[PDB]
Amino acid sequence: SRPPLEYVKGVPLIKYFAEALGPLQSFQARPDDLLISTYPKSGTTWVSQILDMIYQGGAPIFMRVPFLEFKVPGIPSGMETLKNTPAPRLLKTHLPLALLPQTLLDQKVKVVYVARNAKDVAVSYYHFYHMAKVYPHPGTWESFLEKFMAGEVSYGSWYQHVQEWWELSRTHPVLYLFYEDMKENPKREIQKILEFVGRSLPEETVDLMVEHTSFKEMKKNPMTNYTTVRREFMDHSISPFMRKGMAGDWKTTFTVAQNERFDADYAEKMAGCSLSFRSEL
Amino acid sequence: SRPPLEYVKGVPLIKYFAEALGPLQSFQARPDDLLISTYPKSGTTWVSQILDMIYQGGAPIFMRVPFLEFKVPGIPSGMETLKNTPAPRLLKTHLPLALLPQTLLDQKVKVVYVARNAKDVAVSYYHFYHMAKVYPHPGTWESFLEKFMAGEVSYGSWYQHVQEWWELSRTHPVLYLFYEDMKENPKREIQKILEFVGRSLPEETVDLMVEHTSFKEMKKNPMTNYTTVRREFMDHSISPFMRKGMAGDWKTTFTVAQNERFDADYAEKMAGCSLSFRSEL
Ligand SMILES: Nc1ncnc2c1ncn2[C@@H]1O[C@H](COP(=O)(O)O)[C@@H](OP(=O)(O)O)[C@H]1O
Ligand SMILES: Nc1ncnc2c1ncn2[C@@H]1O[C@H](COP(=O)(O)O)[C@@H](OP(=O)(O)O)[C@H]1O
Ligand SMILES: [Ca+2]
Ligand SMILES: [Ca+2]
Known about the structure:
CATH architecture of chain A: 3-Layer(aba) Sandwich
Order of helices and strands of chain A: EEHEHHHEHEHHHEHHHHH
Bound molecules: adenosine-3'-5'-diphosphate, calcium ion
Protein name (chains A, B): Sulfotransferase 1A2
Oligomer: homodimer
Helix content of chain A: 25-40%
CATH topology of chain A: Rossmann fold
Largest sheet of chain A: 4 strands, parallel
Main location (chains A, B): cytoplasm
Largest interface: A-B, 16 and 16 residues
InterPro entries (chains A, B): P-loop_NTPase, Sulfotransferase_dom
Radius of gyration of chain A: 18 Å
Shape of chain A: globular
Number of helices of chain A: 13
GO biological process, one term (chains A, B): sulfation
Catalytic activity (chains A, B): a phenol + 3'-phosphoadenylyl sulfate = an aryl sulfate + adenosine 3',5'-bisphosphate + H(+)
Strand content of chain A: 5-15%
Strand order of the largest sheet of chain A: 4-3-5-6
């Protein structure tokens, strides 16, 4: 019923996910866990499918890759789904570093992080707010854009999220990937994931993973497109989860006025950062 | 009902497996197939389980690894089971090179062959003849030993089998392994299989494969011990498939007289061969 967001340590989150944090400090990480970390709508489902295939030598995605802080009225908790989970475990989270279960850092769990350009994230997040009913109603795109720029959306600021994890990468095992690089050359990025997780697969098998993990395929696959969930939960008729999967599509939504204001605000928040994003390709 | 063996191109075989050869020249091999080749009771099930785990990133074994020439009164044909089989395929065969579907050689299919010392093979084969009722009754061990030395058992001569494939290894991709080496150092042999099939797995995961593919484990696992099959097919009460899994246990069955005769006969059949087997460890 589109419940307002709950702030936690300065971070606004889905009411339910906020409640799920208590049961969350009990969580104990294993040395062989693989943590998939991302700001919302940055390629989480995409890299999850890739990692899952890899872990199977080549049920829906949300069952195979437990969502750490997950929790919803008529659905099993993220930590629940993780109980019936044998090692090695693939985990998923969008949690900022201030809310991340300390155990993951203490065990040096390998992290595959994916960052996506902020403009495409914003548009993708606006449409998701519409279809996923656990989120407060977004309002107009104009108002949502403002909330997104002020980090007044679920999981907080995108600017801080991509920067903190980028910095964490200096003293913690982290493979920091870019949604755009994955778009441009999927095989290249999958090979980087294989090497990073200490695995190898014949060229032929990787080429097959590239075909099956393409937007087109993943949009048909009911195990990856989230269509098996209930309508009053996610209304694919409003906006499909597998919306467009493009890089640079934000140009058909941002007005010139909004783009000018966003860029100015951006340069100001990404000043001292060495992170470089490309909004096209 | 213990039907006599059928000779084919000079090779005696299970009546049913003989019949299964016709439907067999229709078989078409793919470039990515992986062929597990062995003379009977040489570690086929063992290396099959290992390869299957590898192919899954770490149903019973006979369903997951189709048995090429398989065929039995109340059970689906080997090529049948292979129809519902997606690439990449793991295949199993005990066929001598004269009966091997040419397509496997023409496609350069990777072969993992396992050889075991003849004395342990003989004893293991004698007990298998007893429990598996598709084989003619073995008779006494004394008589079986003689039949085994004369290649008058299913799949013919062991001497020729281990030599021809050893030679094939010079002009065809073949990883020739020894049952004994696998006993002595399983991790070492599994790493050789990984490299050979162009795969890689973290050390920790391989150590886990070594534990689960040990004789003890595989003897409990109903998916690998063949206990789900029907009794009038295989009578585990007569002799369990997972008998002992030892190297050098042939000393408790061979009499000194039989051993002296076997050695003399052996030196004569393995003369010009560079193959070296160790009957202990
Ligand atoms: N295989 C794939 N290739 C490209 N984009 C994909 C993809 N699977 C999902 N996506 C896109 O990733 C976004 C969702 O990411 P997440 O899984 O983190 O929530 C959506 O972006 P759009 O809204 O821009 O289409 C979605 O269409
Ligand atoms: N994991 C394992 N480790 C050691 N030996 C194994 C094994 N799995 C099966 N075996 C042994 O391999 C032989 C059967 O081989 P195959 O699978 O080729 O028919 C039997 O030998 P014994 O009769 O000597 O015990 C069996 O016990
Ligand atoms: Ca989701
Ligand atoms: Ca068998």
